[PDB]
Amino acid sequence: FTMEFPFDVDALFPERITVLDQHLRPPAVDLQQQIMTIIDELGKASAKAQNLSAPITSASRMQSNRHVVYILKDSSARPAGKGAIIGFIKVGYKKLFVLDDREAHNEVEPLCILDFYIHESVQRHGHGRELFQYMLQKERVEPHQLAIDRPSQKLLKFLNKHYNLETTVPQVNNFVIFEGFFAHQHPP
Amino acid sequence: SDKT
Numbered sequence: 026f027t028m029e030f031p032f033d034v035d036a037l038f039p040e041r042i043t044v045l046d047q048h049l050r051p052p053a054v055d056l057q058q059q060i061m062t063i064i065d066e067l068g069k070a071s072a073k074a075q076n077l078s079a080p081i082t083s084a085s086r087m088q089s090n091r092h093v094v095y096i097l098k099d100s101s102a103r104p105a106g107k108g109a110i111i112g113f114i115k116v117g118y119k120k121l122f123v124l125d126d127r128e129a130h131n132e133v134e135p136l137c138i139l140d141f142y143i144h145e146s147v148q149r150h151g152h153g154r155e156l157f158q159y160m161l162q163k164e165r166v167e168p169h170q171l172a173i174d175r176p177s178q179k180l181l182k183f184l185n186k187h188y189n190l191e192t193t194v195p196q197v198n199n200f201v202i203f204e205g206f207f208a209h210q211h212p213p
Numbered sequence: 214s215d216k217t
């Protein structure tokens with residue numbers, strides 16, 4: 026993944042952030058395969074960045090799940106003149122049982138952050154925050170209501186810096202939740 | 214979790 030593709034990303038994705046589900050519908054010469062290629066390359070790049078041995082995001086996995094992907098294109102002009110992709114965030118609701126600090130196992134179904142990646146060359150340029158904000162607004166969720174699949178320390182620092190989130194009770198299911206997640210807790 |  027270099028951000029650029031051998032087709033016109035701006036023609037494919039007219040909007041700054043494009044939201045796709047399992048159907049991978051092109052916005053309105055196989056435009057759907059253009060989208061699938063972008064997702065495949067994004068997933069491979071994200072896995073590499075997270076020290077994972079294989080991708081957790083791909084076109085095929087989008088098609089066989091009920092996840093939603095938000096894709097941020099580059100709003101600047103590139104020298105190659107066909108646009109570019111900055112990164113993405115993938116979310117999905119999941120059933121979990123989470124332990125609180127009162128020894129209760131709570132059955133929940135939160136929106137989960139499942140994959141999140143911004144191209145290395147343009148990390149720490151604010152793109153991740155922009156993408157995350159757009160997702161919060163469309164999904165109608167507040168940050169402390171999220172669970173995150175095995176977050177990187179980079180993401181925990183991002184969430185603490187931008188939203189003051191602090192992790193709460195550690196779990197055995199590989200998801201992380203934050204203070205405010207439980208009904209008896211308060212967001213920061 | 215898929216990150217396992």
Ligand SMILES: *SCCNC(=O)CCNC(=O)[C@H](O)C(C)(C)COP(=O)(O)OP(=O)(O)OC[C@H]1O[C@@H](n2cnc3c(N)ncnc32)[C@H](O)[C@@H]1OP(=O)(O)O
Pocket residue numbers: 071074075140141142143144147148149150151152153154155174175176177178179180182183184186
């Ligand atoms: S759970 C998987 C999350 N993905 C990854 O870990 C993959 C590699 N990182 C990324 O794709 C992006 O760096 C993520 C984590 C998605 C954040 O996006 P941005 O880099 O675009 O974030 P912003 O510029 O909006 O915010 C910057 C703040 O984010 C935290 N942070 C970014 N990068 C790091 C690193 N390398 N180490 C520690 N923290 C990092 C910081 O709080 C950073 O604030 P700064 O002002 O740059 O300090």
